[PDB]
């Protein structure tokens, strides 16, 4: 029963592909297993830029030894639910606030 935003095995390119597809918009996001760092996760989010138009940005979600997650060292969370709630409430460094999970 994965959360609506959790796409365990989706590649970075397929995340981009789906996030940029109809049904999604600015703020649309998903969390998937990182293709760069084994055992960690990546956050993919759609954003609208002045010149780029529609774009997707990726953030590495780093793991804290013995439990915990952070995108920026300055603020950590005990779990992904807390992290998603935090960035849903404030962009706090990110390119935009997390709005709705990727629609498929």
């Amino acid at each position: 029963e994965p959360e609506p935003w959790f796409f365990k095995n989706l590649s970075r390119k397929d995340a981009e592909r789906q996030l940029l597809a109809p049904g999604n918009t600015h703020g649309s996001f998903l969390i998937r297993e990182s293709e760069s760092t084994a055992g960690s996760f990546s956050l993919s989010v759609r954003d609208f830029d002045q010149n780029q138009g529609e774009v997707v940005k990726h953030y590495k979600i780093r793991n804290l030894d013995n439990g915990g997650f952070y995108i920026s060292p300055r603020i950590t969370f005990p779990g992904l639910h807390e992290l998603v709630r935090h960035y849903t409430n404030a962009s706090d460094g990110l390119c935009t606030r997390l709005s709705r999970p990727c629609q498929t």
């Binding site: 760069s36 990546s42 940005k57 990726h58 953030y59 995108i71 920026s72 460094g93 990110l94 390119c95």
Partner: peptide, 4 residues
Amino acid sequence: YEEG
């Protein structure tokens, strides 16, 4: 990757 982008940095937050």
